[PDB]
């Protein structure tokens, strides 16, 4: 039916090659241009060009291959944003050995998930990094071998990628003349990606689709000389993961923060005339409170953008004002789908419109019918960045991704009849009662470690404000309590009468379910 979005055709036609070799041809093609600058780090000042990142790129996919390392290996890249991160990312992808990206704020448990689930031959982690590594080693004996990011000598008794390399290339290596690995792109998987959180496999394909759209003058940027991204977001996620890549692809200057700081952020973009930035949604709303950035020439800044995530429209357009934009690139993207399918086609808080090589319906929640027009139901989108699957969970896989290849989302979105996608109150005797304000009040409870509203129907009132709550560690508390400390913080129509349902999790907070197990105890 139309009632399928489909994204138009890009304007950079999917390219033939593995995601190494496209990044490894454009990269190589700046690198001959002396002075191309492809990242900056704005709190050291320092630059490093194509030809320096090329160069230790190449030499490092060549020391893994000479290793040993070949696409049956993992690696995983374990650090804070530095200019450092992306080449063993690059190294990697050249010879189709898969990289898994290790929040670098994990502790050491969400790191041992993580890498237990990636299960790396070779870990290159920063200085800082280490011992968390070296403790997360102890328990996985496939890490046969870690080597240090940000050092140039060897570093602890462990190599550099500085020495690893030099311990591994041939005599008389050249780097111009290295050829990257040819591969099958769909069968090998280029990153795994982490979402108890799961592995994402991303084969070479999704990151290839992904270079289509960062140089489309609609769905991504325009590549113009000199072009400048200031890049704040985590890279070994897929905002800042594939945003990186692109640019790559695009011989852009990215000026890497890992640390945020307002002035320093303002200055940066104005000293590196920074056409792009990138925030998180936290840092959305942090400059949506910023009286500093009129002090500023940002002249050059032509964009501020969310990535897959989406933003308020109050807090898209109070950022827009404060920024002299006209708005902000926002959109919808799931580490499952690589990065947005979804973006804010350049030229309300529509979270933008279905990408090249992509199509996405909204289905009913009841039946899966393919709803139509300003309808709201579940969003399914369909296209080559799906993942390949939850490493080592095919059921997980299975429950995300249909048999026509639909990823069911679980989130409850619809179209207007521009082909524009928004993504998305409990009626007690009439009254309206946002439960998320309930929620609020049941989170600052000391007792209470997590709490999820939905109305319990009851079709006298129309509907009853309940709540799940899943009680903090060693306190007790009973439902009168609950009940009694929500109305001793809100209106009449507000009251919790519909009471409150013990979990241990409360299933963003899916209010169907949340709504299922309240039916489920109470009636």
Request: aromatic share 10%; net charge neutral.
């Amino acid at each position: 039916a139309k009632n399928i979005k489909k994204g138009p055709a890009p304007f950079y036609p999917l390219e033939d090659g593995t995601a190494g070799e496209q990044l490894h041809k454009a990269m190589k093609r700046y690198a001959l241009v002396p002075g191309t600058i492809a990242f900056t780090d704005a709190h050291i000042e320092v630059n490093i060009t194509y030809a320096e990142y090329f160069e230790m790129s190449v030499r490092l996919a060549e020391a893994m291959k000479r290793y040993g390392l070949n696409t049956n290996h993992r690696i995983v890249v374990c650090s804070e944003n530095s200019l450092q991160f992306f080449m063993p990312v690059l190294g990697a992808l050249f010879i189709g050995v898969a990289v898994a990206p290790a929040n670098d704020i994990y502790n050491e448990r969400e790191l041992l998930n993580s890498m237990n689930i990636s299960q790396p031959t070779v870990v290159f982690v920063s200085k800082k990094g280490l011992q968390k590594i070296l403790n997360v080693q102890k328990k996985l004996p496939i890490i046969q071998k870690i080597i240090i990011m940000d050092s140039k000598t060897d570093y602890q008794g462990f190599q550099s990628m500085y020495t690893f390399v030099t311990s591994h290339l041939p005599p008389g290596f050249n780097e111009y003349d290295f050829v990257p690995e040819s591969f099958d792109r769909d069968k090998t998987i280029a990153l795994i990606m982490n979402s108890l959180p799961k592995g994402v496999a991303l084969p070479h394909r999704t990151a290839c689709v992904r270079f289509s759209h960062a140089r489309d003058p609609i769905f991504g940027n325009q590549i113009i000389p000199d072009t400048a991204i200031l890049s704040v977001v985590p890279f070994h996620h897929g905002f800042g993961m594939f945003t990186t890549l692109g640019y790559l692809i695009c011989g852009f200057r990215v000026v890497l923060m890992y640390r945020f700081e307002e002035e320093l952020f303002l200055r940066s973009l104005q000293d590196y005339k920074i056409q792009s930035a990138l925030l998180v949604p936290t840092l959305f709303s942090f400059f949506a409170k910023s009286t500093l950035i009129d002090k500023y020439d940002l002249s050059n800044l032509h964009e501020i953008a969310s990535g897959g995530a989406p933003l308020s429209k109050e807090v898209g357009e109070a950022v827009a004002k404060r920024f002299h934009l006209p708005g902000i690139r926002q959109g919808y993207g799931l580490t499952e789908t690589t990065s947005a399918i979804l973006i804010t086609p350049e030229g309300p808080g529509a979270v933008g419109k279905v990408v090249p090589f992509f199509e996405a319906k909204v289905v009913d929640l009841d039946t899966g019918k393919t709803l139509g027009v300003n309808q709201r139901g579940e969003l399914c989108v369909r296209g080559p960045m799906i993942m390949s699957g939850y490493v080592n969970n095919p059921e997980a896989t299975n429950a995300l991704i249909d048999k026509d290849g639909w990823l069911h989302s679980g989130d409850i979105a619809y179209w207007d009849e521009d082909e524009h996608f928004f993504i998305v109150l409990i009626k007690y005797k009439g009254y309206q009662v946002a439960p998320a304000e309930l929620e609020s009040i049941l989170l600052q409870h000391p007792n209470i470690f997590d709490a999820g509203v939905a109305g319990l129907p009851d079709d006298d009132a129309g509907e009853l404000p309940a709540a799940v709550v899943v009680l903090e560690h060693g306190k007790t508390m009973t439902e009168k309590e609950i009940v009694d400390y929500v109305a001793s913080q809100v209106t009449t129509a507000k009251k919790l009468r519909g009471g409150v349902v013990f979990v241990d999790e409360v299933p963003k907070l899916d209010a169907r379910k949340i709504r299922e197990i309240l039916i489920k105890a109470k009636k």
